[PDB]
Design a protein around this ligand. Structure first.
Ligand code: PLM
Length: 133
């Protein structure tokens, strides 16, 4: 299953191309301005085969709980109501969200002890680097 090295608290230290990613998702300007300023904490935990990813920031908190390979309903930080799934691939923790005939992916992987999130929408790609704290 998911590596235990994902478990714990992670802090955003770098974000690249997040503004264009949010645009591609259809996020409006005022929300994007706050989104670009946010430096969330992400807390990954597990109870049995249920994994929880909680995101905390001054602007927005989100939380998803899921089993790998099992579709679930998600309300995103930007309040999209999506059909989502999280699966592993070569140890990467990969999330897909689908809504209104659209799709976006968020791939979270461990790289030299950091967690790197790569987000893709319509060929637009974001990279967010987190330090374990
Ligand atoms: C919770 C982040 C700040 C709030 C930003 C709200 C508008 C965009 C939200 C949707 C995209 C979220 C992608 C997060 C990927 C990650 O975990 O780094």
């Amino acid at each position: 299953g998911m590596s235990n090295k994902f478990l714990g608290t992670w802090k955003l230290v770098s974000s690249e191309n997040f503004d264009d990613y949010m645009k591609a998702l259809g996020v409006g300007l005022a929300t994007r301005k706050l989104g670009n300023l946010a430096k969330p904490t992400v807390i990954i935990s597990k109870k049995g085969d249920i994994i929880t990813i909680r995101t905390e920031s001054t602007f927005k908190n989100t939380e998803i709980s899921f089993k790998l390979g099992q579709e679930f309903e998600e309300t995103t930080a930007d309040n999209r109501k999506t059909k989502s799934i999280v699966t592993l691939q070569r140890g990467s923790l990969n999330q897909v969200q689908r809504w209104d005939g659209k799709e976006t992916t968020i791939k979270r992987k461990l790289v030299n002890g950091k967690m790197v999130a790569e987000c893709k929408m319509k060929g637009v790609v974001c990279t967010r680097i987190y330090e374990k704290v």
